[PDB]
Amino acid sequence: EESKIEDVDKILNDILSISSECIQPDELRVKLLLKRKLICYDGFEPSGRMHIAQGLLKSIIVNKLTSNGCTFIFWIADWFAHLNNKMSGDLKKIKKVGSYFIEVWKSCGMNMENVQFLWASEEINKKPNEYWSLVLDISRSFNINRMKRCLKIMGRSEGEENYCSQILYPCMQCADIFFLNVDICQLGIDQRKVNMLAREYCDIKKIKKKPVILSHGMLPGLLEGQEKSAIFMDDSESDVNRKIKKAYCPPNVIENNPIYAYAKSIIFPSYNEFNLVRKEKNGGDKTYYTLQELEHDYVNGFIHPLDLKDNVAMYINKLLQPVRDHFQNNIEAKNLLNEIKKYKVT
Template identity: 40%
Template sequence: MDTETKIELMKSFAEEILTEDELRNLFETNDKPLAYDGFEPSGISPIHFGLLRATNLRNMLKAGVKFHLFLADYFGFINNKLGGNLENIQTAGKYFVEVWKACGIDIDKVKIVWASEIMDGLKYWDRVLKVAKEISLERVLRATTIMGRKQGEKLSMGQLFYPPMQVTDIFHLNLDICQLGMDQRRAHILAREVANKLKWKKPIAIHHHILLGLQGLQKKETEEETLMASKMSKSDPKSAIYMHESFWELKNKINTAFCPPKIEEGNPLLEYCKYIIFKNFKEMKIERPAKFGGDIIFGNYEELRTAYVNGDLHPADLKNNVTIYLEKLIKPVREHFERNKKARELYELVKSYKITR
């Protein structure tokens, strides 16, 4: 695969690339660059993990990128996920691996890395201290939004270690590419700045879109606060669609979702079409009664968007058909957890844990 084709694969899901020129040079000089996606294991998988991020990973693997799935168990411990119970957090991590398997990810092509494994040595903590020396306390406090905390929120001393530790992971794993959501941007900016200061390899950052929750856009004073308030959160059942929803649970959630007629901005259902449905299907067929115009096929998101904002597609018809297409994607995952004993046991355990933040 040539360099420009690889670049286009990355741009197909990236909201931001820091920087495209650096990424192009990387592909021209390295056939198998190393990337990662990391997260704190907790709660039940929503569609932005099981569908959106899995689709991004498939594109990276197509481009020849080697990939680490980073299970940030100790970060979840620091951030008080699942009550800070490390054993439960690690069980949740194993459950999330099963979700990606069920989504069709070839886990043999992905290296699973636990934070607790790489932290077990002086070399890691030596790097943490070197990174921390290059970051002001003010920058650390601003960066605490990467763990879902508001600026000014009361934090433990342990949580202040979180940003320099996340930056250190990037260098300790010798990553070429950081592939996470836009909500992790502050950590990657810090990593690039620290790399310049310490003369370490500068990571390229590829940031994907943060999927809106069912409640739609929640405008706040700042762009960052708006992002945090609006995103789909696995800890909030009213905002999230989970990978285990039954058809009727899914239908009920979609039917109550924010979906104003003729409006694209802040409309979560249009987002699900753009970032999930059209990434997994070549076209989207809207089934509707003949008296309302009959069936119509959209070959891409722009066609669908145009019809919707022009009033040629009613919210009820959009909701009905988003439900149908999401069900097609969720059903195989649901069935995997019903058939596979190990997966089912992990799911039942994680479902029993109390969600904390």
């Protein structure tokens, strides 16, 4: 039993280090000690070009989970994007974007057996009685104001026009968790309200198989007053360099620093190091083997923001290269990327 318990403890510690919040790691240990494959999932509204957090950052946690034997589902939330007034509600364009998402994921670390690309409308229509019965029962269990606390999962707020779709959307997202038999909800922190709703629903219905909530931190925006104007998976080297140099990067400050966050959350996990290239008069080249020294050097002003930007832009361009090469060589992926670049984001 020793070797069986040793690895699970170090698995949990590596998971909790790359995850911002885990609702009860004690339950996660119970599921990690199961003689089966766990079901993890994340969901995505095909609303346009893919954010760097949904591709490069996503591959880091996904490969950590799948390499231990877990299955990770990519929930292509096409009906949710239509419900959330994305892509002018055109479901035809949404499915085009969804196909572009699969091509990006397959070229940035998710061309794997333990990854599944599931379309929301396709899977719901296969078992509609089961899915919609879930949605109905969930709506019967919570009041309006409790459901309006989940408005953040759509990028909305209670200060604007609150449409009935904003009540229906979280009922369906809560239903997906049971419909997909999810063990671990691996979504961003901005999704935790509806994730806490599914656990609350289990207590109401006396369901003992409660999903574990494993939230990953939100990558801040490139500009100043931003916490969630961004790097896209299709940006060329010229675009990444232009966006990084104009980005917000306050000296000695780590919070809401999108440049440091890219180095801490994407670059460092992907390389197990951070090679900072500088001129000698600015401190010279230095190889960082721990985030503790990187944080210390930036807070104390050892790393100037200009030097951090140039290295972050260089690393991001290295990580985006297999994506660029897939879209420049796979002609069917190129035409798919060229077509979705013609859409108005709503």
